[PDB]
């Protein structure tokens, strides 16, 4: 009882949202190199037996819609859920191609009480995005 | 007979709260590069938190920014593991 049950018929879904091109208003430049990340993740999770679904350049509205729809699927035969977000961001925020979305709005769809087929199962959100504008200058070792 | 609605979530952030996250135009982001590498090498054995800890070390020790703009040069990064998990997670099962 110390380890999550991972022997369901399916390991689960791995949703990858890969945002590279943004609208000028955001002031965010093209996220060069993100396609490498998306391909790497796809292969990595495919090897772990996850059902990978890659989505490119989604608006904030589309991100929410995708998340809502995915959370409404029947995950009964899935051991877990994985969502990878690749985009620009700020603390507590992820960027759609046209603007910010609160991360809480995205993760809320999967709450133990809002996605019953995932209750008690690990829900992983992997987030490659900035969380502010501070730099870590490091310290010599 | 009940569990918190916030339980069983794991947020693997690429960087610490309030900080920038680094991405290389040719090789991809430092965090994703490291995450995939550690999963490929250790997912058949190590528990997830331990894999993510190795990711933290890899990003922290093997990467440092290089930029013609001194303002963005020689910077470092540490990922941030946020766990509300209630059990150990292994990406395999023992038949």
């Amino acid at each position: 009882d110390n380890s999550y049950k991972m022997d369901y018929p399916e390991m689960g879904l791995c949703i990858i949202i890969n945002n590279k091109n943004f609208h000028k208003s955001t002031g965010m430049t093209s996220r060069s190199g993100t396609d490498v990340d998306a391909a790497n993740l796809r292969e990595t999770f495919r090897n772990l037996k996850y059902e990978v679904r890659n989505k490119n350049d989604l608006t904030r509205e589309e991100i929410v819609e995708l998340m809502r729809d995915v959370s409404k699927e029947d995950h009964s035969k899935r051991s877990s859920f994985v969502c990878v977000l690749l985009s620009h961001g700020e603390e507590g925020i992820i960027f759609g191609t046209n603007g910010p979305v609160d991360l809480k709005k995205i993760t809320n769809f999967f709450r133990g009480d809002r996605c019953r087929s995932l209750t008690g199962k690990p829900k992983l959100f992997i987030i490659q995005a900035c969380r502010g504008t501070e730099y870590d200058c490091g310290i010599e070792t | 007979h009940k569990i918190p609605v916030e339980a069983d979530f794991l947020y693997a952030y690429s960087t610490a709260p309030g900080y920038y996250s680094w991405r290389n135009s040719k090789d991809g982001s430092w965090f994703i590069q490291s995450l995939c590498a550690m999963l490929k090498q250790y997912a058949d054995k190590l528990e997830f938190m331990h894999i993510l800890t190795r990711v933290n070390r890899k990003v922290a020790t093997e990467f440092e920014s290089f930029s013609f703009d001194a303002t963005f040069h020689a910077k470092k990064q540490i990922p941030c593991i946020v766990s509300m998990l209630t059990k150990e997670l292994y990406f395999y099962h023992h038949h």
Binding site: S87, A129 | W22, R23, S67
Partner: peptide
């Protein structure tokens, strides 16, 4: 190297 670019930021994000």
């Amino acid at each position: 190297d670019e930021v994000x």
